Design a protein around this nucleic acid. Structure first.
Lengths: 118, 130, 118
DNA sequence: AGAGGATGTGGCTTC
DNA sequence: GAAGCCACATCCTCT
């Protein structure tokens, strides 16, 4: 699908909803794409946090690069980002040495997620 | 490109790096859902292997650290102070060669740390990119 | 009405009463012994008439379509909260695993005697 | 019988 | 009042 720039000049990632319920499968399978050449089999990891939650609990935050593409099978956010607050994502490509790309205000995780007014 | 041209500038200019150039509060992000006992052993035994997960509490910026150059002794120090550890790991953060540096209380599992531009790897890196 | 079970558990009229607190009321009310009762083993109890319990639970929660199948889903959500566990192999038998003694202020021996359980 | 995943719902609290 | 957090209520798949 449509990619997007990360805080690193070497990596791009898929688009994530701005708001999503915790532990809920994402609408679009997340994936990290390397601009430059990255060896197949190279591991890629995802982490999250901010001023309210220093480290969000995630699920399946590990993927192996393949043809420049590392797609996470069912990544989920369990830790919550806080009212109005968003998560800073830290993408880590394990090359030697490790390359790390961040993505600020990436996604807001809450108990309910988006909901129609009441 | 694995790095940005203004490699040296970006570190001194950009706010992201500036806020992490001073002695910020760091913390072990591993297995937050497990007993403190288990987190303790896990964290130390993992350092011996040369790896750990730490984030700058204040900013909430997480980082996966690899204690090695471009088992160790200079990158992971358990002697420099009883009950403490002085880790150190380089990397290319957002297209900028840097070196993570800090310490953690083997019992509290937290401490202080910060980033430091890496003149060395930075240069040579730009060399490849030409 | 041997003791203020719901009250001693935390229910103070604020918001709906929780399922485990409700079950606790029925267990401290001699008239409900026909459908729900302590097995005589610590805080273990069994719903001898799952449907009657369901109905009551339904009636209290204003949910007419409430049935045992659904109530038990509520109990299973208690396994990770360590509030109530299931007794393996024994049909409709569950057990409070939280610190009821502190809450109620009585020991199971003490409460069984008060409710004359046999 | 029973375990547990997915997702919508109404009570209440906090920003 | 919106937007959080909760504890279910509903529905289902599998063993």
């Amino acid at each position: 699908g449509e990619l997007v720039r990360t805080d690193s000049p070497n990596f791009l990632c898929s688009v994530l909803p701005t708001h999503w319920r915790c532990n809920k499968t994402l609408p679009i399978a997340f994936k990290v794409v390397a601009k430059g050449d990255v060896p197949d089999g190279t591991l890629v990891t995802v982490m999250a946090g901010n001023d309210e939650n220093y480290s969000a609990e995630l699920r399946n935050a590990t993927a192996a690069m393949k043809n420049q593409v590392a797609r996470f099978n069912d990544l989920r956010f369990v830790g919550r980002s806080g009212r109005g607050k968003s998560f800073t994502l830290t993408i880590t490509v394990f090359t030697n040495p490790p390359q790390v790309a961040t993505y600020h205000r990436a996604i807001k995780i809450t108990a309910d997620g988006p909901r129609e007014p009441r | 490109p694995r790095v940005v041209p203004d490699q040296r500038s970006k570190f001194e200019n950009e706010e992201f790096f500036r806020k992490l150039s001073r002695e910020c509060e760091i913390k072990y992000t591993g297995f937050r859902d497990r007993p403190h006992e288990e987190r303790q052993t896990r964290f130390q035994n993992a350092c011996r292997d040369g790896r750990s997960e730490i984030a700058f509490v204040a900013t909430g910026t997480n980082l996966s650290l690899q204690f090695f150059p471009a088992p160790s002794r200079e990158y992971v120090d358990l002697e420099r102070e009883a009950g403490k550890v002085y880790l150190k790991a380089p990397m290319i953060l957002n297209g900028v060669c840097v070196i993570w540096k800090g310490w953690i209380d083997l019992h509290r599992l937290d401490g202080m740390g910060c980033l430091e531009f890496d003149e060395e790897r930075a240069q040579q890196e730009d060399a490849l990119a030409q | 009405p041997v003791i203020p079970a719901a009250a001693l558990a935390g229910y103070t009229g604020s918001g709906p009463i929780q399922l485990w607190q409700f079950l606790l009321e029925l267990l401290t009310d001699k008239s409900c012994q026909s459908f729900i009762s302590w097995t005589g083993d610590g805080w273990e109890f069994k719903l001898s008439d799952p449907d009657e319990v369901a109905r009551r639970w339904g009636k209290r929660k204003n949910k007419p379509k409430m049935n045992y199948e659904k109530l038990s889903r509520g109990l299973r959500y208690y396994y990770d909260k360590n509030i109530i566990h299931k007794t393996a192999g024994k049909r409709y038998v569950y057990r409070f695993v939280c610190d009821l003694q502190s809450l109620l202020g009585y020991t199971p021996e003490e409460l069984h005697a008060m409710l004359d359980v046999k």
